[PDB]
PDB file of C-alpha atoms in Angstrom:
ATOM      1  CA  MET U   4     -30.403  93.309 -16.110  1.00  0.00           C
ATOM      2  CA  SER U   5     -28.662  90.879 -18.439  1.00  0.00           C
ATOM      3  CA  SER U   6     -26.694  93.857 -19.794  1.00  0.00           C
ATOM      4  CA  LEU U   7     -24.844  97.007 -18.758  1.00  0.00           C
ATOM      5  CA  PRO U   8     -26.397 100.476 -18.816  1.00  0.00           C
ATOM      6  CA  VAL U   9     -26.207 102.212 -22.191  1.00  0.00           C
ATOM      7  CA  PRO U  10     -25.055 104.943 -22.332  1.00  0.00           C
ATOM      8  CA  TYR U  11     -22.091 103.551 -20.448  1.00  0.00           C
ATOM      9  CA  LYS U  12     -19.303 105.693 -18.950  1.00  0.00           C
ATOM     10  CA  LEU U  13     -16.052 104.199 -17.683  1.00  0.00           C
ATOM     11  CA  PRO U  14     -13.049 106.098 -16.277  1.00  0.00           C
ATOM     12  CA  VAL U  15      -9.853 104.808 -17.898  1.00  0.00           C
ATOM     13  CA  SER U  16      -6.145 105.385 -18.152  1.00  0.00           C
ATOM     14  CA  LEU U  17      -4.709 104.478 -21.544  1.00  0.00           C
ATOM     15  CA  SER U  18      -1.119 103.952 -22.491  1.00  0.00           C
ATOM     16  CA  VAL U  19       0.548 102.466 -25.515  1.00  0.00           C
ATOM     17  CA  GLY U  20      -0.109  98.760 -25.272  1.00  0.00           C
ATOM     18  CA  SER U  21      -3.499  99.271 -23.608  1.00  0.00           C
ATOM     19  CA  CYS U  22      -6.712  98.048 -25.151  1.00  0.00           C
ATOM     20  CA  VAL U  23     -10.443  98.563 -24.765  1.00  0.00           C
ATOM     21  CA  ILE U  24     -12.496  95.442 -25.552  1.00  0.00           C
ATOM     22  CA  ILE U  25     -16.252  95.888 -25.908  1.00  0.00           C
ATOM     23  CA  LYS U  26     -18.593  92.913 -26.092  1.00  0.00           C
ATOM     24  CA  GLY U  27     -22.178  93.564 -27.091  1.00  0.00           C
ATOM     25  CA  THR U  28     -24.944  92.901 -29.553  1.00  0.00           C
ATOM     26  CA  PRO U  29     -26.692  95.226 -32.034  1.00  0.00           C
ATOM     27  CA  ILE U  30     -30.287  95.843 -30.955  1.00  0.00           C
ATOM     28  CA  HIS U  31     -33.223  97.882 -32.270  1.00  0.00           C
ATOM     29  CA  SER U  32     -32.230  96.445 -35.614  1.00  0.00           C
ATOM     30  CA  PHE U  33     -35.724  97.061 -37.011  1.00  0.00           C
ATOM     31  CA  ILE U  34     -35.318 100.884 -36.792  1.00  0.00           C
ATOM     32  CA  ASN U  35     -34.194 102.967 -39.754  1.00  0.00           C
ATOM     33  CA  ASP U  36     -30.615 103.889 -38.736  1.00  0.00           C
ATOM     34  CA  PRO U  37     -29.272 101.742 -35.884  1.00  0.00           C
ATOM     35  CA  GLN U  38     -25.863 102.825 -34.617  1.00  0.00           C
ATOM     36  CA  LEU U  39     -23.052 102.213 -32.137  1.00  0.00           C
ATOM     37  CA  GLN U  40     -20.844 104.979 -30.756  1.00  0.00           C
ATOM     38  CA  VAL U  41     -17.632 104.834 -28.726  1.00  0.00           C
ATOM     39  CA  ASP U  42     -16.034 108.067 -27.463  1.00  0.00           C
ATOM     40  CA  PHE U  43     -12.607 108.513 -25.844  1.00  0.00           C
ATOM     41  CA  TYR U  44     -12.917 111.661 -23.717  1.00  0.00           C
ATOM     42  CA  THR U  45     -10.104 113.639 -22.086  1.00  0.00           C
ATOM     43  CA  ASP U  46     -12.115 114.285 -18.926  1.00  0.00           C
ATOM     44  CA  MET U  47     -15.187 113.010 -17.140  1.00  0.00           C
ATOM     45  CA  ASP U  48     -17.385 115.852 -18.479  1.00  0.00           C
ATOM     46  CA  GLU U  49     -19.183 115.204 -21.734  1.00  0.00           C
ATOM     47  CA  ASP U  50     -18.104 118.765 -22.622  1.00  0.00           C
ATOM     48  CA  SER U  51     -14.452 117.751 -22.572  1.00  0.00           C
ATOM     49  CA  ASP U  52     -12.458 117.062 -25.699  1.00  0.00           C
ATOM     50  CA  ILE U  53     -12.943 113.785 -27.554  1.00  0.00           C
ATOM     51  CA  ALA U  54      -9.647 112.267 -28.705  1.00  0.00           C
ATOM     52  CA  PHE U  55     -11.466 109.673 -30.833  1.00  0.00           C
ATOM     53  CA  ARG U  56     -15.116 109.024 -31.704  1.00  0.00           C
ATOM     54  CA  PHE U  57     -15.967 105.753 -33.475  1.00  0.00           C
ATOM     55  CA  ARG U  58     -19.563 105.902 -34.774  1.00  0.00           C
ATOM     56  CA  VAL U  59     -20.962 102.912 -36.667  1.00  0.00           C
ATOM     57  CA  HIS U  60     -24.080 103.096 -38.813  1.00  0.00           C
ATOM     58  CA  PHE U  61     -24.802  99.372 -38.875  1.00  0.00           C
ATOM     59  CA  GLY U  62     -24.995  97.962 -42.387  1.00  0.00           C
ATOM     60  CA  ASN U  63     -23.597 101.182 -43.867  1.00  0.00           C
ATOM     61  CA  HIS U  64     -20.323 102.727 -42.665  1.00  0.00           C
ATOM     62  CA  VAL U  65     -18.220 104.022 -39.756  1.00  0.00           C
ATOM     63  CA  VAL U  66     -17.347 107.656 -39.146  1.00  0.00           C
ATOM     64  CA  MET U  67     -14.353 108.577 -37.004  1.00  0.00           C
ATOM     65  CA  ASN U  68     -13.438 112.038 -35.779  1.00  0.00           C
ATOM     66  CA  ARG U  69     -12.095 114.101 -32.890  1.00  0.00           C
ATOM     67  CA  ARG U  70     -13.423 117.175 -31.035  1.00  0.00           C
ATOM     68  CA  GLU U  71     -11.319 120.036 -29.599  1.00  0.00           C
ATOM     69  CA  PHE U  72     -12.786 122.988 -27.677  1.00  0.00           C
ATOM     70  CA  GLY U  73     -16.233 122.043 -28.915  1.00  0.00           C
ATOM     71  CA  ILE U  74     -15.141 121.898 -32.555  1.00  0.00           C
ATOM     72  CA  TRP U  75     -15.174 118.776 -34.662  1.00  0.00           C
ATOM     73  CA  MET U  76     -12.212 118.179 -36.944  1.00  0.00           C
ATOM     74  CA  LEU U  77     -12.152 116.523 -40.357  1.00  0.00           C
ATOM     75  CA  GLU U  78     -13.775 113.085 -40.213  1.00  0.00           C
ATOM     76  CA  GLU U  79     -12.593 109.780 -41.683  1.00  0.00           C
ATOM     77  CA  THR U  80     -14.849 106.942 -42.842  1.00  0.00           C
ATOM     78  CA  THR U  81     -14.813 103.317 -43.937  1.00  0.00           C
ATOM     79  CA  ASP U  82     -17.535 101.095 -45.401  1.00  0.00           C
ATOM     80  CA  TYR U  83     -16.143  97.968 -43.727  1.00  0.00           C
ATOM     81  CA  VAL U  84     -18.654  97.260 -40.945  1.00  0.00           C
ATOM     82  CA  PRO U  85     -18.664  93.466 -40.356  1.00  0.00           C
ATOM     83  CA  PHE U  86     -21.392  93.337 -37.703  1.00  0.00           C
ATOM     84  CA  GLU U  87     -24.442  91.038 -37.740  1.00  0.00           C
ATOM     85  CA  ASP U  88     -27.951  91.857 -36.525  1.00  0.00           C
ATOM     86  CA  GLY U  89     -28.691  90.146 -33.216  1.00  0.00           C
ATOM     87  CA  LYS U  90     -25.254  88.481 -32.963  1.00  0.00           C
ATOM     88  CA  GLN U  91     -22.721  89.321 -30.277  1.00  0.00           C
ATOM     89  CA  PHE U  92     -19.586  91.080 -31.483  1.00  0.00           C
ATOM     90  CA  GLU U  93     -16.192  91.718 -29.971  1.00  0.00           C
ATOM     91  CA  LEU U  94     -14.955  95.228 -30.746  1.00  0.00           C
ATOM     92  CA  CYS U  95     -11.282  95.611 -29.898  1.00  0.00           C
ATOM     93  CA  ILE U  96      -9.552  98.989 -29.798  1.00  0.00           C
ATOM     94  CA  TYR U  97      -5.805  98.563 -29.394  1.00  0.00           C
ATOM     95  CA  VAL U  98      -3.650 101.539 -28.388  1.00  0.00           C
ATOM     96  CA  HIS U  99      -0.496 101.451 -30.505  1.00  0.00           C
ATOM     97  CA  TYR U 100       2.257 104.035 -30.482  1.00  0.00           C
ATOM     98  CA  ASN U 101       0.873 105.776 -33.547  1.00  0.00           C
ATOM     99  CA  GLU U 102      -2.810 104.860 -33.798  1.00  0.00           C
ATOM    100  CA  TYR U 103      -5.870 103.194 -32.368  1.00  0.00           C
ATOM    101  CA  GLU U 104      -6.336  99.927 -34.231  1.00  0.00           C
ATOM    102  CA  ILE U 105      -9.977  98.847 -34.447  1.00  0.00           C
ATOM    103  CA  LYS U 106     -10.834  95.189 -34.893  1.00  0.00           C
ATOM    104  CA  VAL U 107     -14.285  93.622 -35.176  1.00  0.00           C
ATOM    105  CA  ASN U 108     -14.376  89.882 -34.428  1.00  0.00           C
ATOM    106  CA  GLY U 109     -10.636  89.554 -34.960  1.00  0.00           C
ATOM    107  CA  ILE U 110     -10.483  91.508 -38.237  1.00  0.00           C
ATOM    108  CA  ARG U 111      -8.754  94.864 -38.485  1.00  0.00           C
ATOM    109  CA  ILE U 112     -11.124  97.421 -39.968  1.00  0.00           C
ATOM    110  CA  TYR U 113      -9.268 100.704 -39.413  1.00  0.00           C
ATOM    111  CA  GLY U 114      -6.400 102.532 -37.807  1.00  0.00           C
ATOM    112  CA  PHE U 115      -7.116 106.040 -36.460  1.00  0.00           C
ATOM    113  CA  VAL U 116      -3.864 107.951 -35.998  1.00  0.00           C
ATOM    114  CA  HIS U 117      -3.473 109.680 -32.642  1.00  0.00           C
ATOM    115  CA  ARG U 118      -4.069 113.453 -32.870  1.00  0.00           C
ATOM    116  CA  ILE U 119      -3.337 113.822 -29.127  1.00  0.00           C
ATOM    117  CA  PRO U 120      -1.423 111.421 -26.856  1.00  0.00           C
ATOM    118  CA  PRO U 121      -3.618 108.498 -25.756  1.00  0.00           C
ATOM    119  CA  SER U 122      -2.409 109.137 -22.205  1.00  0.00           C
ATOM    120  CA  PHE U 123      -4.711 112.175 -22.273  1.00  0.00           C
ATOM    121  CA  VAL U 124      -7.820 109.953 -22.416  1.00  0.00           C
ATOM    122  CA  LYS U 125      -9.611 109.694 -19.083  1.00  0.00           C
ATOM    123  CA  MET U 126     -13.036 108.236 -19.939  1.00  0.00           C
ATOM    124  CA  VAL U 127     -14.679 105.896 -22.447  1.00  0.00           C
ATOM    125  CA  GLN U 128     -18.353 106.206 -23.288  1.00  0.00           C
ATOM    126  CA  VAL U 129     -20.385 103.631 -25.229  1.00  0.00           C
ATOM    127  CA  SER U 130     -23.786 104.615 -26.591  1.00  0.00           C
ATOM    128  CA  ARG U 131     -26.651 103.992 -29.023  1.00  0.00           C
ATOM    129  CA  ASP U 132     -28.223 100.757 -30.300  1.00  0.00           C
ATOM    130  CA  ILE U 133     -26.406  97.938 -28.532  1.00  0.00           C
ATOM    131  CA  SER U 134     -26.890  95.656 -25.607  1.00  0.00           C
ATOM    132  CA  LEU U 135     -23.574  95.816 -23.783  1.00  0.00           C
ATOM    133  CA  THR U 136     -22.214  92.711 -22.019  1.00  0.00           C
ATOM    134  CA  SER U 137     -18.690  93.711 -21.008  1.00  0.00           C
ATOM    135  CA  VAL U 138     -16.009  96.344 -21.306  1.00  0.00           C
ATOM    136  CA  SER U 139     -12.416  95.364 -20.553  1.00  0.00           C
ATOM    137  CA  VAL U 140      -9.332  97.596 -20.325  1.00  0.00           C
ATOM    138  CA  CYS U 141      -6.066  95.674 -20.733  1.00  0.00           C
ATOM    139  CA  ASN U 142      -3.302  95.890 -18.166  1.00  0.00           C
TER     140      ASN U 142
END
């Protein structure tokens, strides 16, 4: 009631210069493998292609990938996961001409190069072990 439903599904239109800003807090931190997942889908169905999946294993690493016609492509990872148990974070995903830039609390942690045009994204889903306070899509 203090937070948004998770999983969370938001229709979006993205263009270069757009952003998706997610404010939330890691929860269930006492479980073995707490996670956060953000998916950029090309349609409202969860069976549609995923232009970009950002999946954090808190305290461990992030895995990023894309899905086309049900098939996952080669993933990318980084160990830089500057989140804190029980503390609110600001996760910023900026849509540049060439990549999604991901920032956590003002710090760039990765750039995921576009494999399809970001204008093809129609929905953002946020899932797993967070309390979600706000999602903002820049004008």
